[PDB]
Subunit: 406 residues, 4 copies
């Protein structure tokens, strides 16, 4: 028997996702058409012997979260429960606080997945490596650039036994090119160190990386499993576009019916395109590489869509060019309008990928990044929105370049 | 019998007020301690013969608006009613749509006040000028700079009869140094041109300046009354600070009990300071010129407060310097933190006052302006927030300069 | 050009609909599968020359109402607008207040339909009778029992000219067996008397029956059109069951694809049954006469359903007998449970049909009527709910007979 | 060091409190002017050595609960924290689930108080009896009638050692006249049996009475402390009136400034009357025994008020007689109206006190009990509401006797 614990965040963790996280929680944001933790629930339900999927977070249970829970329980034939913490307890404090609900039924192991990662999720390879070695902590790690590794949690390991000897969460110097993927496999024995950490706080909030991983490294309890699959961290609102690109590439092997094909009565399609069946796309439109369309989306004639996410209810009128953008829920773009962003991907292999701070700014200047329209944003006709963030329920009247429209 | 129609906006008009308008409507924002339309209701209730005050807007009636209506009806001994439009009808369409509720009881005249202006409100002088001349439209106008007049509605008048011969709402060239103050006195006859405008739209939405004032100028129906009192337009979130400075100057003659004095068991006070009676200020704090404090505000020891608005529930810890800022509701500033903004007063007499567009930006760079903290914003200890806008329910961890923290 | 004004109510008018009106507005309650004003919008869109459908009420625009407006505009290829009044103005005050939006485009006539009636809606016969005679007011009337007519608005007419000579809204004595159906055809001239009524209130709230119909009767302005089709008034929560029965009978001629047929892999079906396509019904269930099933409804094996309405999301477990009941949204009925009500159809032709007051009671005793379960009501296994009203979000544990479970 | 755990319920437990629990949670309902758990927090803050007060329940944290938490932390100079469970875990499951937050700081003992009891709260006598004997469980028990004891949890004890030998929660036969008061004193050792109960459920939800108290009775771990003070159980909405009478009697010794006195410019006062300082009572009114008035309540001239609770914002017009009633928030009673109920105090000493079931009914007939008006209920002039329950936001037009007005 196996279990899966998906550590979704809370409303404070979604503030960096801010113009999209104003209407729906950041875990329920659709990357490549389905919500971002439905990829985790998909991959965990594919593992044989998986009995339960628990979601630990401090979101209050509202209608989108409970509707997603019912839909996931019906779709994947598995109990998907939401354990709500009484306070933000960190990444390890929710695992220690819900230890009786996690260890109920005595599982052999339980996965611990951070909800903001986009991975190919090699849970079966990781599980079998654990079934051979049977250590308390198993980490998923991937190789990164030497400049990019200072953004992520570096893992210094011994290559013979694959045992991590050092862990630094954000080192100022290069210590390792292997970074932590946010996918873990825990033995039941792994809830025994967390307790000790909790007792050291009493002589509540446990950070799993700083208090458990960095402190127990080199003592034979934490081990690494290295993969070469796709991996990304969805932190800001524009990172979901790169995660969408990766997931649409993954759909060529995983869900080939989800990608859209060339149809004689349909639109032109380049690259990997997801179109929802409820969405009505005009045949004169062309939908370029890495485009996701949601339900009830009207796409007019002559619409160019490239590297974009169009959320549900949005309307693009005729001859509208949308590049590197996220078009919010119910937000309408008028005719001959151009919604353009500059490509900015958070990949740990690109040397001049960006350094991914909380600040969207530099020297007063807003950095050129993905154009994000919030929900119910009205873009007028023949108006350019370039490199801009538009907050929800905004009606614009002129062109805006490199701004944050409050 | 006289009436007063205060044209409050709706949720779309308050988007430019965005980080403060996320919790309460822009009409109910407290400038100099009381909400911004309570100044209008104060000045209209002081006029003898004022029977009713109507508020026309397309806000939905929620608990702050109805609570304000009950409090204003109890305080000013007058019926204060809220007429909610079915759609945003512009500045004149709500006056024409509610013509039966405005003309009920057959009033002699009714004032029409835009809710976003800060004025000294000379309604008695304006009323008596109208009682001498009895024209359909009477405008309040003030003198402006030649560079600043292109931001406001310019009025070209004839100086003998005080009759406006030309009206342009935003001219690209200088046409006049007299600008429209957003205070009008309407005769019942003035609802007769608006009807004609409505019929010309059928062969709904009536803009009072573009469709009525500019079109009927020079035909003997619109007349001007010129004042020298205080006037300001509250459009962005930082303009409310300048309106607070003007209203606290007005309080020296109007409400001398509202300004705070030097008390031996109290804080040091420079200039005009409003402190709410519920607020607890430490005696080591000094509160500089043009400072407004709301209810339930804890101000620690050694706190410097200058040119600021501290909204209700906010906590400033010890040795905190706050200059040119608006501290939101329930937002906490830690010890030795510095919340600083750059003074940007929107007055039509200063030649290098700013040009007051929708964009807060220039050339990518955020313009140096008032620091605005949203509601429930936690500022950590020994952290500087300089020239920044922080959106609500944000917990910061480091210093931010010249940014918009989403 | 023709128009249609559907007078939906507000939240005060839906209080008599109380356990069902706690979640959705009373106009959007599904009778025979579609919402109750979608029957009016269906019948008005079938009339040739119908340009617009206006809904006048004092509900605040929330997500169900706006979602219905968008769905109706897409389905019926017609502008369906919602005009929200600033106050409850009665049945005629909303018609007089929105006279400029009603008469916009100069229509030949406009229908006025009360939203709570279930009719066969003979708008074409009524329109053609009006096109022959061209009087200001045309009423739809039907024949009733002599005892039942005291519940409805009686119309004393002259049979040669079909002109009403007397109108009493609720007479204590028998004056007429013709009652008002709540369907009217108005000429533009008919907005001229309403104005006079409004002026008599000033020397706002206009009741169309008491102030206009009873006062102008016999003066040649109000005329009657008599039909023999189906008619019912949906006032209480159990009246919607009888309206569902009538509409499912009407579906045999109007929408024959909406009624469910005998399928070899499907459930047994007696009488007129509506099943939503999303609903999953077990083949061992039998669904008796006048049964409506909503979307996402799981119906177990052996379920008897007769004369019932099962709202969306509800779950009936195995061997559950449900008779004369309304099962709310998401409400679950356990196995071998019996949810039973007593039939009490409100038709004006039955002599011992009930007298339809606000009180559900008599002499302390609750009257035997339709069993209503609110939303998210959990009925446990092997438990009888007989003649009872269960308020929403209630979890029961034992059998309840003839009660109101708060 | 001592702690206090107040087991507030959740939204399902407040359904029996239904017409009052529609607006505010049942723990925050004001009995004798202050909310019902503020009596518990008052009595726990009076105990020396009390460090923390924890509230365990499954209410979601909304604005009334957090506002009460901030007000209680400011008033009683104590940390008052709310621990929200992830699910309804019963009366013992929340104590076992939050065992690390309860035992944090290693307290000597912690009180466990059910939030629905009205007691005199003898925590110091109970604590000192525990400090002499040091047993895991200490119960508060009171003597009841032989007929009434079948409603409560009976305790069969040995009178020499005060050790309970038998516990039955609702016996069909008389077993004991000592009943459980819902006040407990727990040693840290008492969290050790609860764990065993939890493990027996795995081979979550722990009922403290059925699983722990009845099973461990007679084994030397549970002991009784008997008091003679006031005690009541607030289960239905009308039980709060009897708890208000008991607390106003307690105010003669505990808060003598809260009771209202005879004032020459004030109303006549019989018995124990609480009046809020914000409430304006006319001098011609007389306020009889056991009357509680909330803030902002306007009481007209000639108003008789006896055995009543008037919640905040309510308006009683002139010559209005209100007896045995609960007048909701913002609910207005017109002039010469009579709001009357039948006394129904659920005390365990009265032999013909009522048997206190979930059903408010008998044989179809509604039982004569306390008249409850919900929030914003408008009672018209000269109209009698007798023995009736009126659900919130209802506007009545005639007299109602012995009904539930939906
Ligand atoms: N339940 C719960 N989950 C949390 C909490 N804080 C963060 N998380 C989740 O834990 C995951 C990682 O949290 P972070 O603190 O941002 O760590 P990280 O920056 O992604 O770093 P790595 O895990 O090393 O890749 C995300 O999915 C968060 O949503 C918390 O307080 N409670
Ligand atoms: N009722 C109503 N009021 C409105 C509407 N639009 C704007 N207002 C109010 O009318 C006033 C002025 O509106 P604006 O269009 O922004 O005009 P302005 O820029 O202030 O220009 P001036 O009036 O010339 O000083 C403000 O108080 C708005 O809140 C509307 O659609 N309906
Ligand atoms: N817009 C609006 N509609 C209303 C108002 N009051 C009632 N209605 C609607 O008008 C219709 C009839 O209202 P009622 O006052 O209950 O009249 P009735 O009892 O149905 O009587 P008849 O029309 O003669 O059959 C219903 O559809 C109500 O929803 C109102 O104040 N404003
Ligand atoms: N935290 C929490 N508290 C609960 C729960 N269920 C009930 N309570 C509280 O526990 C107290 C008693 O609950 P009941 O089950 O109704 O027991 P009782 O009928 O009052 O019986 P006695 O305690 O013997 O007097 C009340 O204050 C409830 O609000 C729960 O699931 N979680």
């Amino acid at each position: 028997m196996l279990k899966a614990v998906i550590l979704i965040g809370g409303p404070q963790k979604g503030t960096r996702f801010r113009p999209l996280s104003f209407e729906v929680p950041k875990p329920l944001f659709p990357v490549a058409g389905v919500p971002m933790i439905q990829h985790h629930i998909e991959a965990c339900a594919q593992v044989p012997g998986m009995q339960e999927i628990l979601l630990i977070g401090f979101y209050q249970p509202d209608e989108p979260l409970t509707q997603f829970l019912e839909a996931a329980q019906q779709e994947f034939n598995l109990p998907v429960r939401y354990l709500q913490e009484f306070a933000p307890l960190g990444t390890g404090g929710g695992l220690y606080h819900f230890r009786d609900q996690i260890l109920a039924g005595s599982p052999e192991a339980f996965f611990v997945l951070n909800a903001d990662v986009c991975s190919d999720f090699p849970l079966s390879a990781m599980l079998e490596a654990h079934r051979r070695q049977r250590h308390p902590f198993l980490l998923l790690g991937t190789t990164a650039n030497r400049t990019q590794s200072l953004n992520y949690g570096c893992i210094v390991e011994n290559p013979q036994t694959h045992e991590v000897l050092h862990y630094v969460e954000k080192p100022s110097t290069f210590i390792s090119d292997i970074i932590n993927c946010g996918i873990y496999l825990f033995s039941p024995e792994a809830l025994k160190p967390l307790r000790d950490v909790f007792q050291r706080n009493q002589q509540g909030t446990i950070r799993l990386e700083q208090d458990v991983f960095s402190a127990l490294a080199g003592q034979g309890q934490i081990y690494v499993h290295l993969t070469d699959g796709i991996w990304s961290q969805i932190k800001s609102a524009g990172s979901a576009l790169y995660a969408s690109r990766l997931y649409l590439s993954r759909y060529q092997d995983t869900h080939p019916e989800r990608l859209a094909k060339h149809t004689p009565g349909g639109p032109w399609i380049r690259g990997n395109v997801y179109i929802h069946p409820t969405a009505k796309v005009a045949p004169s439109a062309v939908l370029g590489p890495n485009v996701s369309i949601g339900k009830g989306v009207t796409v007019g004639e002559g619409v160019r869509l490239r590297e974009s996410i169009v959320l549900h209810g949005a309307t693009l009128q005729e001859h509208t060019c949308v590049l590197h953008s996220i078009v919010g829920w119910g937000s309408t773009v008028g005719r001959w309008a151009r919604v353009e962003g500059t490509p900015s991907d958070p990949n740990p292999n690109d040397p001049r990928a960006r350094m991914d701070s909380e600040s969207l700014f530099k020297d007063g200047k807003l950095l050129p990044a993905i154009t994000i329209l919030g929900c119910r944003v009205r873009i007028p006709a023949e108006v350019l929105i370039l490199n801009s963030i538009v907050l929800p329920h905004k009606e614009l009247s002129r062109s805006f370049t490199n701004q944050i429209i409050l």
